[PDB]
């Protein structure tokens, strides 16, 4: 049986003699934008999921991008895709015209 070659361990804070062990290892940021890209005056728009560190839960946000602290609970990976999902099917719906997703991390 060979299942240790595909199995992976995910990084944690190890644990002091006081603390327990807390996994998440870093602040996992994912931002996605949206945009007509024509000479129409469309106000792109951004969204943001977020997991902190050392905190399993999701978070999202969705003001509006330049040319405050309004987070709500996401509750967990697939919640979030269900999420970036609609907001991406509302968007062009909403749009009537052309638009994209530019997608970035970290």
Request: charged share 25%; net charge negative.
């Amino acid at each position: 049986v060979d299942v240790e070659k595909y199995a992976k361990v995910e990084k944690s804070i190890k644990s002091d003699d006081s603390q327990p062990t807390v996994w998440p290892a870093h602040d996992v940021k994912d931002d996605y934008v949206f945009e007509c890209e024509a000479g129409t005056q469309y106000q792109k728009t951004k969204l943001t999921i977020l997991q902190s560190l050392g905190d399993p839960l999701y978070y999202g946000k969705i003001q509006p991008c330049k040319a405050h602290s309004n987070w709500f609970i996401i509750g967990s990976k697939t919640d979030a895709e269900r999420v970036v999902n609609q907001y991406q099917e509302l968007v062009q719906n909403e749009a009537k015209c052309p638009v994209k997703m530019s997608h970035s991390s970290s």
